[PDB]
Design an enzyme around this catalytic site. Sequence first.
Site, PDB file in Angstrom:
ATOM      1  N   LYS B  43       0.994  -1.312  -0.060  1.00  0.00           N
ATOM      2  CA  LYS B  43       0.002   0.093   0.118  1.00  0.00           C
ATOM      3  C   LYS B  43       0.889   1.244  -0.020  1.00  0.00           C
ATOM      4  CE  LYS B  43      -3.121   3.031   0.627  1.00  0.00           C
ATOM      5  NZ  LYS B  43      -4.042   3.225  -0.390  1.00  0.00           N
ATOM      6  N   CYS B 130      -1.004   9.917  -6.478  1.00  0.00           N
ATOM      7  CA  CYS B 130      -2.086   9.803  -5.633  1.00  0.00           C
ATOM      8  C   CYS B 130      -2.982  11.205  -5.778  1.00  0.00           C
ATOM      9  CB  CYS B 130      -1.698   9.977  -4.127  1.00  0.00           C
ATOM     10  SG  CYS B 130      -3.043   9.813  -3.151  1.00  0.00           S
ATOM     11  N   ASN B 132      -5.860  11.600  -4.100  1.00  0.00           N
ATOM     12  CA  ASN B 132      -6.794  11.537  -3.328  1.00  0.00           C
ATOM     13  C   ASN B 132      -6.534  12.366  -1.902  1.00  0.00           C
ATOM     14  OD1 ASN B 132      -8.808  10.009  -4.832  1.00  0.00           O
ATOM     15  ND2 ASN B 132      -7.419   8.377  -4.299  1.00  0.00           N
ATOM     16  N   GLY B 250      -7.911  -1.219 -15.465  1.00  0.00           N
ATOM     17  CA  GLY B 250      -8.826  -1.911 -16.343  1.00  0.00           C
ATOM     18  C   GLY B 250      -8.818  -3.585 -16.618  1.00  0.00           C
TER      19      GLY B 250
HETATM   20  C1  LIG Z   1      -8.704   0.640  -2.799  1.00  0.00           C
HETATM   21  C2  LIG Z   1      -8.005   1.633  -3.667  1.00  0.00           C
HETATM   22  C3  LIG Z   1      -6.690   2.111  -2.970  1.00  0.00           C
HETATM   23  C4  LIG Z   1      -5.639   2.486  -3.827  1.00  0.00           C
HETATM   24  N1  LIG Z   1      -4.238   2.834  -3.218  1.00  0.00           N
HETATM   25  C5  LIG Z   1      -3.265   2.965  -4.005  1.00  0.00           C
HETATM   26  C6  LIG Z   1      -1.971   3.242  -3.329  1.00  0.00           C
HETATM   27  O1  LIG Z   1      -1.894   3.258  -2.360  1.00  0.00           O
HETATM   28  N2  LIG Z   1      -1.128   3.647  -4.256  1.00  0.00           N
HETATM   29  C7  LIG Z   1      -1.209   3.727  -5.758  1.00  0.00           C
HETATM   30  O2  LIG Z   1      -0.249   4.048  -6.459  1.00  0.00           O
HETATM   31  N3  LIG Z   1      -2.423   3.423  -6.337  1.00  0.00           N
HETATM   32  C8  LIG Z   1      -3.450   3.023  -5.571  1.00  0.00           C
HETATM   33  N4  LIG Z   1      -4.874   2.997  -6.162  1.00  0.00           N
HETATM   34  C9  LIG Z   1      -4.813   2.946  -7.553  1.00  0.00           C
HETATM   35  C10 LIG Z   1      -4.791   1.671  -8.118  1.00  0.00           C
HETATM   36  O3  LIG Z   1      -3.445   1.181  -7.682  1.00  0.00           O
HETATM   37  C11 LIG Z   1      -4.759   1.511  -9.396  1.00  0.00           C
HETATM   38  O4  LIG Z   1      -3.819   2.348 -10.262  1.00  0.00           O
HETATM   39  C12 LIG Z   1      -6.292   1.913  -9.980  1.00  0.00           C
HETATM   40  O5  LIG Z   1      -7.192   1.425  -9.382  1.00  0.00           O
HETATM   41  C13 LIG Z   1      -6.537   1.693 -11.418  1.00  0.00           C
HETATM   42  O6  LIG Z   1      -6.250   0.335 -11.808  1.00  0.00           O
HETATM   43  P1  LIG Z   1      -7.500  -0.497 -11.732  1.00  0.00           P
HETATM   44  O7  LIG Z   1      -8.176   0.069 -12.919  1.00  0.00           O
HETATM   45  O8  LIG Z   1      -7.036  -2.065 -12.046  1.00  0.00           O
HETATM   46  O9  LIG Z   1      -8.336  -0.534 -10.724  1.00  0.00           O
HETATM   47  C14 LIG Z   1      -5.810   2.579  -5.241  1.00  0.00           C
HETATM   48  C15 LIG Z   1      -6.997   2.147  -5.807  1.00  0.00           C
HETATM   49  C16 LIG Z   1      -8.000   1.949  -4.841  1.00  0.00           C
HETATM   50  C17 LIG Z   1      -9.332   1.152  -5.440  1.00  0.00           C
END
Ligand SMILES: Cc1cc2nc3c(=O)[nH]c(=O)nc-3n(C[C@H](O)[C@H](O)[C@H](O)COP(=O)(O)O)c2cc1C
Lengths: 311, 311, 311, 311
Positions: B43, B130, B132, B250
Site C-alpha cells: 500500500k 495519488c 486523493n 482496467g
Molecule cells: C482501494 C484503492 C486504493 C488504492 N491505493 C493506491 C495506492 O496506495 N498507491 C497507488 O499508486 N495506487 C493506489 N490505487 C490505484 C490503483 O493502484 C490502480 O492504479 C487503480 O485502481 C487503477 O487500476 P484498476 O483499474 O485496476 O483499478 C488505489 C485504488 C483503490 C481502488
Amino acid sequence: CLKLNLLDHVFANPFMNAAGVLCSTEEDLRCMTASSSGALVSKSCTSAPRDGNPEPRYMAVPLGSINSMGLPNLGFDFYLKYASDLHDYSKKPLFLSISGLSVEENVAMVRRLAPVAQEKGVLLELNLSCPNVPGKPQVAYDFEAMRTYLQQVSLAYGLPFGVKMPPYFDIAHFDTAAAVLNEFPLVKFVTCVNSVGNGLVIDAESESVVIKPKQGFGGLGGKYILPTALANVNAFYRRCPDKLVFGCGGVYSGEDAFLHILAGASMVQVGTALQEEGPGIFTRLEDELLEIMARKGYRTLEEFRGRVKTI
Amino acid sequence: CLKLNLLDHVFANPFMNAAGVLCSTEEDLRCMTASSSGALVSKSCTSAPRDGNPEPRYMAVPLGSINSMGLPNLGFDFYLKYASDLHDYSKKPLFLSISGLSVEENVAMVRRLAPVAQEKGVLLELNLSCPNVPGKPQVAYDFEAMRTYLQQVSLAYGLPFGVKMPPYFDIAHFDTAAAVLNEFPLVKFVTCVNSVGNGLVIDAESESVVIKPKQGFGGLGGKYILPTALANVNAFYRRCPDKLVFGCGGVYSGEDAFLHILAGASMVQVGTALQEEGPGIFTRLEDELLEIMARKGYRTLEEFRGRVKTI
Amino acid sequence: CLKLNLLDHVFANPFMNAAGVLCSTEEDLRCMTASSSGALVSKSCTSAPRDGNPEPRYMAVPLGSINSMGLPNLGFDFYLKYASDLHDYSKKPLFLSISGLSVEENVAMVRRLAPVAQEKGVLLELNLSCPNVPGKPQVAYDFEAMRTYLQQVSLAYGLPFGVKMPPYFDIAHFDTAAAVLNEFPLVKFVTCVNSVGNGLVIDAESESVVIKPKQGFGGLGGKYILPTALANVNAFYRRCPDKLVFGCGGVYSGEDAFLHILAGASMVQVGTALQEEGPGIFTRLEDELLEIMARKGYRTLEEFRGRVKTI
Amino acid sequence: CLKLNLLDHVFANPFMNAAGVLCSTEEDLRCMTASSSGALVSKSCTSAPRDGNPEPRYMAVPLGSINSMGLPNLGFDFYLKYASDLHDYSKKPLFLSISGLSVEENVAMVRRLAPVAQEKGVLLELNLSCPNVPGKPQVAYDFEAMRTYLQQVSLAYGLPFGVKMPPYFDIAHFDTAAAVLNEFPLVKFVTCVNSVGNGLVIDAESESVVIKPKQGFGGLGGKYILPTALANVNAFYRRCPDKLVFGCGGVYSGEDAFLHILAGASMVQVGTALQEEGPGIFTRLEDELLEIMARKGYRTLEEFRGRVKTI
Ligand SMILES: Cc1cc2nc3c(=O)[nH]c(=O)nc-3n(C[C@H](O)[C@H](O)[C@H](O)COP(=O)(O)O)c2cc1C
Ligand SMILES: Cc1cc2nc3c(=O)[nH]c(=O)nc-3n(C[C@H](O)[C@H](O)[C@H](O)COP(=O)(O)O)c2cc1C
Ligand SMILES: Cc1cc2nc3c(=O)[nH]c(=O)nc-3n(C[C@H](O)[C@H](O)[C@H](O)COP(=O)(O)O)c2cc1C
Ligand SMILES: Cc1cc2nc3c(=O)[nH]c(=O)nc-3n(C[C@H](O)[C@H](O)[C@H](O)COP(=O)(O)O)c2cc1C
C-alpha cells in the site's frame, strides 16, 4: 417542465447534441433542429474545410467510443452560413462550435461570427479541448494558452460565448482552469467535458488499435467518461458560479442527464449515445429525465441543478 | 511461459496487485505473497501511519470503482519492516510503494529504504500520482515538481526504482512526462497508470455522491480507465525505451492484461478487479493470458510485448 | 453486410430488441422501429392489459439484471393494433410476442393475430418461458404443456411462428425440448433464451431482495446468462436444423452477438443491455459485429453462423 | 463467532470447499484440512477411479468458470480410505461427496461408507446434480429418479446425509424438488447449488468453445450464478424447513457468503473462487464475513440466517 432560460435564450429542454455529433452537414443540423433537443451545436469548425484524420477514426465500443476525427468539418463558411441563413431559430437556439488550429485562426473566425451572433443570436462555443488534431494538444490543458485564446477571442468577439473544456483530473487544474475562465466575463458558459483525450482501444484478436490516427490514440466518450464528466461539471459549477456549466459526457439516460444536472449542468449535451442512437435519443432522454423528476417531485430543472448531495 | 526477468529479478508471471489494493495490512501482503501473482506491491505509505480520508471512501461500481482512500497505511516503518523481515522473497519479488506528501518525506523514506532494498532486493515504486490526499495534487502532473521529486529520490535512494504514473490525456503531456522521467536513469520502470483522478460518481436515487471525501471526488479504476491505461502504457513504452513500463488499469481478464502487454507492459497490476475478486484473480488472469498466448502461438510475453499493431 | 433473409422477410441486420425491452408502448415501438435494429418484437402481451407485478420489479445490476415484471403490457388489442395499423413494415420486420397465461388465451389471441400476420407479415413469437407470473410456471419447462401449447397455437394460428424458449441446463432437456419443437413445422424459429428464471439478487447492506415480486425472485438477464444463452442457442441450433434459432441473452457487444451467431443465431436480440443503453446499442452492435467480421474476413453472417469450433 | 453446530458436528466457521474443487488428491484434502475452512468435502467420486472428461475441461473466465470435468476422481476406495484413515477429524468435519452414475453404484458406495460414517462421523454429500458426465443428466432434474436415488441411498445408508442439488429456475421445480427431498428424513441437508448446467463459453477470437468435452457445454460457476444460487438456497431454505441448506455458488467475498446465509445458508461452499485463489480464500472469507457482521452488529450467523428481507 424541462424549459430553462440561459444566455438570453429559451430552451425547450436542456438536451442538445455534443459538438461533432450529428452536426457536420446541413442535413445533420436540419435533423438536430428537427429533433426534440433543446438546442444544437455545430461541428467544431476551422477556417477552411477539413477532411479530418484518416479512417477508421471513430469506433463505437461497449463502454462508449474512441475517436480521432481530427476536426472534419465543412468549414467555418458553411457553419456560419448555416447559423446566418439556414437555421430556423424559432425551432431552437443554435450553438456554433469553433476550433481554429491557432489563436489567430479563431480570432479571424469569431470576428466574422460576431455580426451573425449579434444579429441572429447564434451562440459561440470555443472548442479549446480537441485532443485529436496531430501536433495540436488540448489548448485548455495549457492554462496560459487558454488564457490567451480567451483574451483574444473575448476581444475580437466582444459577445457572450462558451468554452468546450477538456476533462481535468487534478483538483489544482480545476482551480486554475476556473481561475482563467473567471477572468473572462464574456465566457458565459463552459461545456464539461470534451472527450477524455488520448485513450487507446486495442483489439486483442487483431492485436491492433481500433482507429488509424495517432497510432490509435483518440478521445474517449460514452460510459467510460461519465464519472469524469460529472466531476468536471460539478468542479466548474462550483468554481464558476457566475457562469453556466454545460454538462457533457457519458449520457445515455435521463438518469445520466439527471446526474449531470444534479452536478450543476444547465444544458446537457449527448455525444456518443447520440452518435449511435440518432436524434430520437432526445425524446427518450427527455421522457426519462421527466419520469425521474416526477418520482423525486421536481417540477423544474433549477430545483435540483447542482444540488448533488455530498456526504 | 509467463515468466519474465525484470529489474534483476525473476517474476513467475507479469501479474501483481496495484499499489493500495490487498497490500495494506500484514495479512494482505501475506495474502498477496500466497497468491499466484508474479509479485506484490505494498500500500502506498507515508512516513507516519495514516487513517486515510473519511469513509465511505471506496465505491465499487458496475464499470469499476471510485475511491478517495487518502493514503490509509500503517506507516513506512511497517512496510519497511515487512520488506526487511516479514516478506518471503523466495516467493515473489516485493515492490514497496512510497507516497510521501512531500519531497522531504519521500527522501526520508527512500533513505531508510535503500539499505533494505540493497539487501532484500525489495523494489521501490514511488507514487507520484495519488489523487486523493486533500490539498496534495498529483505530483506527476507538475513536471517540475516531478523532476524535483525524482532527483531527490534518485539521489537519496541511489538504487533502481519505479514511478507510479498518473494518466495523461494530452500528447504533449506524454512527451514532457517522458522527457522528465528519461532524465533519471535510476527510474527503471514506470507504472501506468494510477487512478484516473477526481472523477465524480453520483447516485441518481439518493442524489448524493457515493464517497465522502472531497465532495465525492475520487480516483476512478476498472473498466472506465482501460483505454486510458493502454494509451499511457503505450505512450511511455514508446517514449521511455530504456525503461520498463508496468501496466495498471482496467484489468479484469487475461485479455485486458494481453492488451496491456501488447501496449508495452512488462508487469501488469490489477486494482479494482482484485479489490472485488480476491487474489484468486491472478490464477485466472494467468490461465486466461496463457490461453490467449496459446491461440496466438506466443510462448513468451516478450514475443508480443509492445507489439500492438497500428493502422 | 449484416443483411439476412429470414422467414420470407428481409432484415437489415440480425439485431433486434428482446421482447419486453423498449417495446411496451406505442412510443417504445416507434423508438425501436426508428432505431438501426433489423427488427423489433413487441412486449409479451396478454388478452387484456396487465399492470404487471409490484414494483420495484426491475433492477439493473453490475452483471445484468433481475426482474419480475409480470408481463406488464398494454393488452393484446393494442399490439395487434400496432401490428395492423401503426408499424411501418417498410422500416423493418415486426415480431409480436404473445404470452397468454393459458393455452386458451393464446389460441384466442393467435386466431385474431393470424389475419393480421397474414396481411402485414407480422411474425408471432409465442412466449412459453415467462418466469415472472406468480402461479404460472414457465410452460416450456413442462414439455407436455409445451407440446399442447404448440399444437393449439399451430392449429389455431396456422401460420409460421416462433417460440421464446426458457434456458435449459440439462442435455436431456435440450433433446426433449427440441424433440417437441420439431413436431411443429410452423415453429419456424425458437428464440434462445428468455430470462434465467427465478434468480435472487440480495443487497448486502439492506439485507433485502432488490425486487418486490415473488419475494425477490426474478429472471436474470445480461452478463450472467451469456454462457447459458450461447448454450441454448447452440443446443437448439444443432437440434432444430430445420428451424431458425434467434439468439438472446448477455449481448452487450458485437462480439457477444458474434458468439451468438457463431453459436447458431440468425437474429440476435438485446434485452438488459438495451434496457440500460437505449436503441443506440443496435448501431454500436452493428458496427462492432462488422468490425469483427471485417477482421475475420467474413462478408456475410451466413459465413460464420453456427460455425463455433469445438475441440 | 462464525462457529456453528450442524449435523451433530461443530464447525469453526460456515466455510468449506465446494465438492470437486481442491479435494481430489490426498494432498488437496490435506490442504483443505489445513486451511481455515470449517469443513471440507471430497471430490465427487464413483466406485472406480475416473480420468474425467478430455481436457481442456475447465476454464476460468472473468465471471467465474465453465467446466466439464466429468467426475475425475481417485475412486471411492481412496476417498473412503481418506475418511476412514487419513482425515484428521480433530481439525474439521469431513464431507465425502458421492456421485455414482447409477443408483446401484451409489448404493454400493453408501453401504461401504455407512460403517465409516457411523464410526468417523464423515458426512455424505450425495451428488445428484453433476451436469458434465456424458449421457448422464442431472439426476435431481428427474424428480422420480431423484426420488429413487434417495430411497435407495437412504435405505442402504441409514444415516444422515445431504444432497448436492442442481439449480432450478422454475418455482414449480423448487416446490417439487423440495416435495421429493422432504420425503426423506435422512436427508438432513441440501447443498444449493451445483454448477449451472451446460452453459456455453465460446472464444470470439478462436471462434471455438473453450472446453473440449460435450462440444463446449459445461457447468457454470463463479460470479455468473450467484443470484441463481441465492435463489435456490432461499427457495430450499423455505421449502425444506426441517433440513439444513448449505449454500454454494458465486462466493468470492464474505459479503457473498453473507448473502447466502441471509438467504438461509448454514454452510457456505466456495468452488470457482477457491479454484483460483487457493485455501487462503477461507481466511479471507472469514475475515470479510466477520467485518460485515461486525458492522451489522451480528455476533452469530444464526442471528441473520435466512433473515433476508423481502419487499
Ligand atoms: C482501494 C484503492 C486504493 C488504492 N491505493 C493506491 C495506492 O496506495 N498507491 C497507488 O499508486 N495506487 C493506489 N490505487 C490505484 C490503483 O493502484 C490502480 O492504479 C487503480 O485502481 C487503477 O487500476 P484498476 O483499474 O485496476 O483499478 C488505489 C485504488 C483503490 C481502488
Ligand atoms: C464523433 C465525435 C466527434 C466529435 N467532435 C467534436 C467537435 O467537433 N468539437 C467538440 O467540442 N467536441 C467533439 N466531440 C466530443 C463531444 O462533443 C463530447 O465532448 C465527448 O464525445 C464526450 O461526450 P459523450 O460521452 O456524450 O460522447 C466529438 C465526439 C465524437 C463522438
Ligand atoms: C425488463 C424486462 C422485461 C422483459 N419482458 C419480456 C417479455 O415480455 N417477453 C419475453 O419473452 N421476454 C421478456 N424479457 C426477457 C428478455 O426478452 C430476454 O430474453 C432476457 O432479458 C435475456 O436477455 P438479456 O440478457 O439481453 O437481457 C424481459 C426482460 C426484461 C429485462
Ligand atoms: C473444477 C470443478 C469441479 C467441481 N466438482 C464438483 C464435484 O465433483 N461435486 C459437486 O457436487 N460439485 C462440483 N463442482 C461444482 C461446485 O461444487 C459448485 O457447486 C459450483 O462450482 C458452483 O459454486 P461456485 O460458484 O463457488 O463455483 C465443481 C466445479 C468445478 C469448478
